[PDB]
Each structure stands twice: as structure tokens, then as C-alpha cells.
Scaffold this active site. Structure first.
Site, PDB file in Angstrom:
ATOM      1  N   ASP A  27      11.268  13.907 -13.165  1.00  0.00           N
ATOM      2  CA  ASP A  27       9.882  13.958 -13.591  1.00  0.00           C
ATOM      3  C   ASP A  27       8.961  12.967 -12.895  1.00  0.00           C
ATOM      4  O   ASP A  27       7.830  12.804 -13.330  1.00  0.00           O
ATOM      5  CB  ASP A  27       9.736  13.894 -15.147  1.00  0.00           C
ATOM      6  CG  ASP A  27      10.284  12.666 -15.734  1.00  0.00           C
ATOM      7  OD1 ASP A  27      10.415  11.627 -14.963  1.00  0.00           O
ATOM      8  OD2 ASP A  27      10.545  12.661 -16.989  1.00  0.00           O
ATOM      9  N   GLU A  42      17.115  10.758 -17.724  1.00  0.00           N
ATOM     10  CA  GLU A  42      17.239   9.825 -16.626  1.00  0.00           C
ATOM     11  C   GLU A  42      18.440  10.255 -15.804  1.00  0.00           C
ATOM     12  O   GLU A  42      19.340  10.965 -16.302  1.00  0.00           O
ATOM     13  CB  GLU A  42      17.346   8.365 -17.097  1.00  0.00           C
ATOM     14  CG  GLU A  42      16.233   7.856 -18.013  1.00  0.00           C
ATOM     15  CD  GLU A  42      14.871   7.827 -17.366  1.00  0.00           C
ATOM     16  OE1 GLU A  42      14.872   7.471 -16.158  1.00  0.00           O
ATOM     17  OE2 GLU A  42      13.831   8.128 -18.073  1.00  0.00           O
ATOM     18  N   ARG A  99       3.916  10.836 -12.307  1.00  0.00           N
ATOM     19  CA  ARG A  99       4.742  11.272 -13.428  1.00  0.00           C
ATOM     20  C   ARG A  99       4.178  12.573 -13.950  1.00  0.00           C
ATOM     21  O   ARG A  99       2.992  12.731 -14.221  1.00  0.00           O
ATOM     22  CB  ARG A  99       4.606  10.144 -14.465  1.00  0.00           C
ATOM     23  CG  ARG A  99       5.320  10.416 -15.849  1.00  0.00           C
ATOM     24  CD  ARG A  99       6.809  10.553 -15.692  1.00  0.00           C
ATOM     25  NE  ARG A  99       7.500  10.503 -17.011  1.00  0.00           N
ATOM     26  CZ  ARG A  99       7.603  11.530 -17.836  1.00  0.00           C
ATOM     27  NH1 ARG A  99       7.133  12.726 -17.520  1.00  0.00           N
ATOM     28  NH2 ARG A  99       8.286  11.390 -18.965  1.00  0.00           N
ATOM     29  N   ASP A 105       9.630  15.663 -20.293  1.00  0.00           N
ATOM     30  CA  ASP A 105      10.571  14.543 -20.178  1.00  0.00           C
ATOM     31  C   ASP A 105      11.859  15.111 -19.652  1.00  0.00           C
ATOM     32  O   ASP A 105      12.525  15.925 -20.298  1.00  0.00           O
ATOM     33  CB  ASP A 105      10.758  13.819 -21.554  1.00  0.00           C
ATOM     34  CG  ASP A 105      11.505  12.461 -21.387  1.00  0.00           C
ATOM     35  OD1 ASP A 105      11.333  11.821 -20.305  1.00  0.00           O
ATOM     36  OD2 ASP A 105      12.188  12.134 -22.379  1.00  0.00           O
ATOM     37  N   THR A 106      12.240  14.655 -18.482  1.00  0.00           N
ATOM     38  CA  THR A 106      13.610  14.931 -18.003  1.00  0.00           C
ATOM     39  C   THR A 106      14.546  13.787 -18.380  1.00  0.00           C
ATOM     40  O   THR A 106      14.131  12.673 -18.530  1.00  0.00           O
ATOM     41  CB  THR A 106      13.631  15.082 -16.439  1.00  0.00           C
ATOM     42  OG1 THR A 106      12.971  13.987 -15.753  1.00  0.00           O
ATOM     43  CG2 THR A 106      12.905  16.375 -15.981  1.00  0.00           C
ATOM     44  N   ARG A 163       1.383   4.952 -12.525  1.00  0.00           N
ATOM     45  CA  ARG A 163       1.735   6.266 -12.054  1.00  0.00           C
ATOM     46  C   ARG A 163       0.646   7.248 -12.309  1.00  0.00           C
ATOM     47  O   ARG A 163       0.008   7.222 -13.346  1.00  0.00           O
ATOM     48  CB  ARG A 163       3.034   6.768 -12.794  1.00  0.00           C
ATOM     49  CG  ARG A 163       4.166   5.774 -12.685  1.00  0.00           C
ATOM     50  CD  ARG A 163       5.483   6.226 -13.317  1.00  0.00           C
ATOM     51  NE  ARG A 163       5.265   6.334 -14.759  1.00  0.00           N
ATOM     52  CZ  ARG A 163       6.186   6.719 -15.629  1.00  0.00           C
ATOM     53  NH1 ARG A 163       7.433   6.943 -15.258  1.00  0.00           N
ATOM     54  NH2 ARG A 163       5.840   6.874 -16.932  1.00  0.00           N
TER      55      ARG A 163
HETATM   56  C1  THP Z   1       4.212  11.288 -19.436  1.00  0.00           C
HETATM   57  C2  THP Z   1       3.510   9.996 -19.916  1.00  0.00           C
HETATM   58  C3  THP Z   1       4.250   8.879 -20.038  1.00  0.00           C
HETATM   59  N1  THP Z   1       3.550   7.739 -20.442  1.00  0.00           N
HETATM   60  C4  THP Z   1       4.316   6.470 -20.742  1.00  0.00           C
HETATM   61  C5  THP Z   1       4.930   6.578 -22.205  1.00  0.00           C
HETATM   62  C6  THP Z   1       6.298   5.850 -22.094  1.00  0.00           C
HETATM   63  O1  THP Z   1       6.030   4.424 -22.307  1.00  0.00           O
HETATM   64  P1  THP Z   1       7.334   3.478 -22.433  1.00  0.00           P
HETATM   65  O2  THP Z   1       7.829   3.075 -20.982  1.00  0.00           O
HETATM   66  O3  THP Z   1       6.614   2.280 -23.146  1.00  0.00           O
HETATM   67  O4  THP Z   1       8.421   4.146 -23.191  1.00  0.00           O
HETATM   68  C7  THP Z   1       6.672   6.136 -20.599  1.00  0.00           C
HETATM   69  C8  THP Z   1       7.684   7.309 -20.597  1.00  0.00           C
HETATM   70  O5  THP Z   1       7.858   7.644 -19.145  1.00  0.00           O
HETATM   71  P2  THP Z   1       9.303   7.845 -18.642  1.00  0.00           P
HETATM   72  O6  THP Z   1       9.929   9.039 -19.384  1.00  0.00           O
HETATM   73  O7  THP Z   1       9.078   8.084 -17.095  1.00  0.00           O
HETATM   74  O8  THP Z   1      10.202   6.612 -18.937  1.00  0.00           O
HETATM   75  O9  THP Z   1       5.432   6.384 -19.923  1.00  0.00           O
HETATM   76  C9  THP Z   1       2.238   7.736 -20.662  1.00  0.00           C
HETATM   77  O10 THP Z   1       1.648   6.694 -21.078  1.00  0.00           O
HETATM   78  N2  THP Z   1       1.474   8.832 -20.507  1.00  0.00           N
HETATM   79  C10 THP Z   1       2.111  10.008 -20.112  1.00  0.00           C
HETATM   80  O11 THP Z   1       1.413  11.027 -20.011  1.00  0.00           O
HETATM   81 CA    CA Z   2      12.200  10.633 -18.063  1.00  0.00          CA
END
Ligand code: THP
Ligand code: CA
EC number: 3.1.31.1
Length: 129
Positions: free
Chosen positions: A15, A37, A29, A34-35, A75
Site C-alpha cells: 500500500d 505488512e 500511501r 490497508d495491506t 506521505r
Molecule cells: C491511509 C492513511 C493512513 N494514515 C495514518 C494512520 C496510521 O497512523 P499510525 O502510524 O499512528 O498508526 C498510519 C497507518 O498507515 P500504515 O498502514 O502505512 O502503517 O497512517 C493517515 O493519517 N491517513 C490516511 O489516509
Molecule cells: Ca499497511
């Protein structure tokens, strides 16, 4: 929403992908999915799926939603298209991602994505197997 040009710099995982957008390297991103890890079950398959889709594409496009365009990690947040096919949707449809992180105002394609998840779940694909 509007599709804008980008070029692939490098596949990262299911993702996230590094693209050049308006002439600058950026990690994107994928919105609203959500994929797993890489270290988790179906993580390797999700990574491989995205990588094949973006590496094989002749034309990558970025489509921002109406809300925030960058997350707190810097991102880019977008829907990513490979030769007109949405990667976000394709992953959900194959049971390689779940609909997730649906925030108000970046949720234009939510119901398209949920429809794909329902069909993946009905087919018992991958995550849903
Ligand atoms: C997809 C997405 C993720 N995020 C943030 C939420 C999660 O915060 P936390 O790192 O605090 O858990 C993280 C999840 O991305 P990942 O699944 O790449 O880890 O990115 C956003 O803020 N907005 C978004 O649209
Ligand atoms: Ca992920």
C-alpha cells in the site's frame, strides 16, 4: 476528482509506492485501504501484486481526494491508477487489502471499495480464505 500524471520510482509494499509527482520524489500511501505488512500473512503477496501492477503500467496516475493530501509522515494520500485501473480497488478485490482508514473528506471512493471487498469476501480470497 482529477487524475494527474506521475512516474514510478520504486515499488515499496502493498500500500505504499514511491512516485515522481510534479517532478519531485514522494512516497504515496494508498487511500482507504490497508495491506498486511511484508512480515505478516499475505504481506508478501500484497507487495508483489502492487509491484506488478505499477511496474507493468505504461501510465501511472495520482488522484487526490477532497481532504488532506499528505499524512503526518509526509506521505502523499491518493488513489493510484495503473493504465486506468485503480490499484486500491484491485488490491481490495483480490482480498489482498481491507477497506480501512476511511476518514471523512477523503472518502469519495469508499463505497466502490466496499463493493470490491464484499465480492472478495464472497469468493473467500486470500485474507478472506
Ligand atoms: C491511509 C492513511 C493512513 N494514515 C495514518 C494512520 C496510521 O497512523 P499510525 O502510524 O499512528 O498508526 C498510519 C497507518 O498507515 P500504515 O498502514 O502505512 O502503517 O497512517 C493517515 O493519517 N491517513 C490516511 O489516509
Ligand atoms: Ca499497511
Amino acid at each position: 476528482l482529477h487524475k494527474e500524471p506521475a512516474t514510478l520510482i520504486k515499488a515499496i509494499d502493498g500500500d505504499t509506492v514511491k512516485l515522481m509527482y510534479k517532478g519531485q520524489p514522494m512516497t504515496f500511501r494508498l487511500l482507504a485501504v490497508d495491506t498486511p505488512e511484508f512480515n505478516e500473512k499475505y504481506g508478501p503477496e500484497a507487495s508483489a501484486f502492487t509491484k506488478k501492477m505499477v511496474e507493468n503500467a505504461k501510465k501511472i496516475e495520482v488522484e487526490f481526494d477532497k481532504g488532506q493530501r499528505t499524512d503526518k509522515y509526509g506521505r502523499g494520500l491518493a488513489y493510484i491508477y495503473a493504465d486506468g485501473k485503480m490499484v486500491n480497488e484491485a488490491l481490495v478485490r483480490q482480498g489482498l487489502a481491507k477497506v480501512a482508514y476511511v476518514y471523512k473528506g477523503n472518502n469519495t471512493h469508499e463505497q466502490l471499495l466496499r463493493k470490491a471487498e464484499a465480492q472478495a469476501k464472497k469468493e473467500k480470497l486470500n485474507i478472506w480464505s
